[PDB]
Swiss-Prot record, chains A, E, H, I, J:
It comes from Conus geographus. The chain holds residues 21 to 36 of 40 of the full protein. The cysteine framework is I (CC-C-C). Alpha4/7 pattern. The modification Cysteine amide is found at residue 16. Belongs to the conotoxin A superfamily. It comes from the Eukaryota. This is Alpha-conotoxin GIC.
Length: 16, 207, 207, 207, 16, 207, 207, 16, 16, 16
């Protein structure tokens, strides 16, 4: 998922 | 817009002395999480195991806040980890200097949150006897601040499950269990607690 | 004309703040391409394969434009890659820090185009089981920005065929196919796409 | 609070010239102590043994003193070890550059006291013959200043016992004894003493 | 047990 | 009169910005020569051979000229290679970063001539099959500028014979031939030539 | 009196420029001496031998002289080797970059003398055939300036005998002889002499 | 061809 | 002989 | 053995 993708995690910190 | 970002970074970084780190007066919470990609080496002759993982670290600084309406609606930016203070979270039983496998760039958001996710290769102390069995073997390594107590850096996790969704599909090893547990240590001599996150991985050779 | 170049580089690098990187407002396209030189190590006990290749990166910045007529008709120059911003394109499944085998020098053109082609040795995750067969084995490694989404760095290739024209003639391995292909990942939680270039190499021991 | 600390660190580091080192007029005492984590390699073919330990160093500089009442009652702080003078304590029979396994951060206290505790991997000269016996084998390596005599840097320990409480529980080796002993040397020619701390570890393969 | 943990040692130097 | 020397380096390096490299308006000739010391590793499992050699590079800049009697009859000086521009001559098929074995100091003469002779250990691509036979085996590696075409850097040798006078007398290998040959290559798409020096070594195991 | 030392170093290093090296007019003598600690690796497959030693270097600069009466009777001080010029003395047949094992600190005395004693691990070219015999084997490695002739850096020794008083008592090898000999060479083309110190060690596996 | 040659590629970015 | 010794080569660039 | 000990050697150069 998103939180496993570093770029996605950093871009969506409210989720990750 | 590019003008606005340049101005934002100027206002945040060149205007101020760098954040000197947390104190007992102004403590800080660091959230830690691991994503295990692979177990890349198992050495039974020296009792060393090598891991490759992504280590997600998140903290928040009031000194990194800004109002987006004041900077062309910019809500976050990316910057070299050298431009900011980062926490001294360390593996306590490594046997070799940790190797960094990714760019060291952090993401800063307007509420002052910082997220930093370095990919790393770690060699650490582990007797792998039994890895070639059905039961497998358990390795553990603790992560914590090198110089700050729990009254200055509180360590937390978001989940106690290590993220295995990117674990290498053709790995030589099968992960039976992988957890990350907050532990608090108290010493008789002293009132302040010391905090670590215990990374515990149970695994075996794949058959 | 040596004076003119000094003046140009002075005007481009000393006058303005550093490019702060791309944003959603002013995105950037990076074109990536590989020239595979050899498969230099295959380790079946650790599931690690080592490649040597040239990695070509190209992008364009408005902040690096100039009028040649104001600078003695200079249309391009070479400069240390440290003098400029470069994109954070990373191998997602490396097992060791990438080693650089060549000078790191960029070519800048008056239209703001930048090209940078470092030689590299990469260790990455791959189970090579089947390498000594007629069928061979396929290895894959994804490249992408470590911190930028596709709304900020768009990654593309010029071709999906890896350049094999310089592949070592007496290599231990035969390349059966080698492709470099743009792939897109979407997450329901979030509007922005994530882009990677998948380097896929199928090979076998030469008989 | 954050202001006071920033101000303190400025006054100590930016306002003053760096400590030019000890002299016989203004001498220094360094306290040395070891915490042994594991014996991580034993090579009978080259007579080299590798240790992983924490090396605690403590000294005091008048130039690092302050009055807490003039700085919001701050009594100590942590800072990069690069910000301060550190002593040239060296292992005399290492065979490879020492590898640092931890952040290099010092604790500075308002009396001018500094404590600095890097984790390290050391390769040093040792014939391991007999390690596979009940009697075991003894290794030794001396630590001392590279250029300062005992009249300029006095070396001492707080205890003659190496701290073994963190020695890896599943280590390949059993520690029979581990001591750290101050030794004083006088040479016929010269009145000034030369001081080392002798790290002596007796160990055997665990069965 | 403080003195074997570097962060603790640094906070309790009169003991460690 | 160190004084005349003191004054010369002042005028050459700091008064002007650094030489920005050659262009098609101000091209440059670099002369290359190798002195082969030993073949220090031959690896048939990965097709890698390691050489140790001295690489002599010579070029000339008008911007480095001076008058000897305006400078105490000084005809040359030595300076850190970091203080001056050096060419980006590179092995095109290395497999590991080149290692430098000597100080990096260049010699500059009053006619603007510069000579720079780094000792190096190079790992490069070579199938050594046949090395243990009477015929031996041939290895080759090309050297050339990473970014400059032949219209900007002309590469030449003074001789096509590799200097073997310092080849290690008790080497594991006998050199059957060693040549260094300028080669010019044109690609149909493009009028500018590309130049390399081809280092070709034929050798066998010594009996 | 710590004040006087600060001022001394300021006058020598910050107010005055760094020594730019010797010239033909103001030449320099460097005295060399070796202390052999151990032969730490012998590799018969690649003809490589590794030594660990202390290299004592001594020279004198007019530009580093001072009057102790003008500086609180300070007669000498220690400072980072980075603060001063050091000679470019190099092993001519190393096979790997030299590794430095000790702090790099020099001792400067008021007559302008500098003594600098780095501990080092050196890999160099040597066929060890005969090491397991009664006669043993002889290895040699030359040390000299990389870029300065004997008219600019004169090299000398204080003794032709290598210091063996610290040779490891339980070494795998016994030293039969170890000498350090100054050699002077002239070439027909040129008047200036070239000087090296030849480190010649005869040794065998211990009986 | 040209594009496998780093120096040539950089001079001919329009093709490579 | 001179041109094979780097210090000598560098000292006599007109010959070496 | 002063001259074999680097710190001592540096302190007694008239001997070492």
């Amino acid at each position: 998922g998103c939180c496993s993708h570093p770029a996605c995690a950093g871009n969506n910190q409210h989720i990750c | 817009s590019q003008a606005n970002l340049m101005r934002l970074k100027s206002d945040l970084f060149n205007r101020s002395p760098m954040y000197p780190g947390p104190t007992k007066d102004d403590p800080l919470t660091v959230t830690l999480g691991f994503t295990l990609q692979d177990i890349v080496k198992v050495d039974s002759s020296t009792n060393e195991v090598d891991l490759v993982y992504y280590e997600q670290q998140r903290w928040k600084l009031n000194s990194l806040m800004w109002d987006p309406n004041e900077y062309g609606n910019i809500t976050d930016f990316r910057t070299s980890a050298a431009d900011i203070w980062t926490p001294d979270i360390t593996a306590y039983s490594s046997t070799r200097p940790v190797q960094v496998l990714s760019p060291q760039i952090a993401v800063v958001t307007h509420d002052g949150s910082v997220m930093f996710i370095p990919a790393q290769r770690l060699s650490f102390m582990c007797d792998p006897t039994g890895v070639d069995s059905e039961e497998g073997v358990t390795c553990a390594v603790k992560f914590g601040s090198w110089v700050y107590s729990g009254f200055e850096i509180d360590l937390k996790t978001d989940t106690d499950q290590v993220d295995l969704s990117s674990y290498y599909a053709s790995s030589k090893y099968e992960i039976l269990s992988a957890t990350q547990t907050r532990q608090v240590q108290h010493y008789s001599c002293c009132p302040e607690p010391y905090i670590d996150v215990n990374l515990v991985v149970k695994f075996r050779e794949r058959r």
